[PDB]
Structure formats: C-alpha cells, structure tokens
Write a structure and sequence with these properties.
Blueprint (H helix, E strand, L loop, with lengths): L3 H15 L2 H15 L16 H6 L1 H18 L6 H14 L4 H18 L6 H25 L4
Helix pairs in contact: 1-7, 2-4, 2-6, 5-7, 6-7
The chain binds protoporphyrin IX containing FE (HEM) and hydroxide ion.
Subcellular location: Cytoplasm, Sarcoplasm
Enzyme class: oxidoreductase
GO molecular function: heme binding; metal ion binding; nitrite reductase activity; oxygen binding; oxygen carrier activity; peroxidase activity
C-alpha cells in the first residue's frame, strides 16, 4: 500500500485537480482519445467527435470529464479503503461498458501526463511517485474484480 506520507502527497496533488475539475477532466479524456482512438469507440456518445477541435468544443465531454474525476477523487480520499466505491465502478466498466484493463492503464498514464502539462515544474518527483502508486492501486483493485468476473475485453 501507500504510506501516510504518500497519501498526503496524493491528496495535495489532487487539490490542483479540484481547482479546475472540468479542465483537468476534459484534458484527460482528450489525451486518452487522441492517443488511443479505439477508446473513443467505447463511447457511443463521443463517436461523432472526429477531430480534437470537436473534442475541445464538446461541453458534454467536459461534463463526462467532471463525472470521471469526481468519482476518482472520492476513491482517492478513501486512501485505499475504497471497496464500496470501487466495486460498482469495476463491475459497470467490465459488464456494461466492456472496458479492458489496458484502457485503465491508458487513462492512468493520461492523468500523469495532464498533471505535468498543466503544472510544469510543479509536479515533483515525490508527487509523481505517490500519484503513480495511487493509480496503480486503483487499477489493481479493479483488475481483481475483473478477474472475479472473468472479464478480458
Ligand atoms: C479513472 C478511471 C475511470 C473512472 C473513475 C470512470 C468513472 C465513470 C463513471 C462514474 C461513470 C458513470 C457511472 C457508471 O456507468 O459506472 C462512467 C461511465 C462510463 N465510462 Fe468510465 N471511468 C473511468 C475510465 C473509463 C475508461 C478508460 C473508459 C473507456 C476507454 C470508460 C468508459 C466509460 C463509458 C463508455 C461510460 C458510459 C458513458 C455514457 O454513455 O454515459 N471509463 N465512468
Ligand atoms: O468514464
């Protein structure tokens, strides 16, 4: 798990996201969709977005970004004690949305990228380490639920 010090770093970094949840959420999803176009195809409601300009102009994309980061933030504030929060998300993403764990790896990487892009020189090595551990814990606990369900893709 994460140490008390590491969780403090995670939640400090998270304050940066909370100052502009929609902007961070939008950029995370755009990074995901442009880097990995197959991910867009999982969103029937974003399939029409044929260019990054269209993505940037989509108010619904920003809305979904807010929903995604709000859910993740709730999970992070549990400092690993997130079974009740995480289980339903893992199950909706496997059974309803059909999201392979690879795509969760992609979005985790996108979050790290966006933090550096929006806060260059202000996302230190310690902070990156801690946030990476938190995202890996999130992904890994989802992976355990995916295995329970026998879900791959
Ligand atoms: C940080 C990781 C993620 C979080 C916290 C998250 C959170 C959420 C939440 C809260 C919802 C709405 C409730 C629900 O259906 O369970 C949702 C819906 C959805 N998610 Fe995610 N999600 C994540 C990653 C992903 C990824 C990587 C994909 C696909 C590449 C994805 C695909 C979807 C889709 C297709 C929906 C339904 C969207 C709609 O049509 O309204 N999610 N997600
Ligand atoms: O999502």
């Amino acid at each position: 798990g994460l140490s008390d010090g590491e969780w403090q770093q995670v939640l400090n970094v998270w304050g940066k996201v909370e100052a502009d949840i929609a902007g961070h959420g939008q950029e995370v999803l755009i990074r995901l969709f442009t880097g990995h176009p197959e991910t867009l195809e999982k969103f029937d409601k974003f399939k029409h977005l044929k260019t990054e300009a269209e993505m940037k102009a989509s108010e619904d994309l920003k809305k979904h970004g807010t929903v995604v980061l709000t859910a993740l933030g709730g999970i992070l504030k549990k400092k690993g004690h997130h079974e009740a929060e995480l289980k339903p998300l893992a199950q909706s993403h496997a059974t309803k949305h059909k999201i392979p764990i690879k795509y969760l790896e992609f979005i985790s990487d996108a979050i790290i990228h966006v933090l550096h892009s929006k806060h260059p020189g202000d996302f230190g090595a310690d902070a990156q380490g801690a946030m990476t551990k938190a995202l890996e814990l999130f992904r890994n606990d989802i992976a355990a639920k995916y295995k329970e369900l026998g879900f791959q893709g």
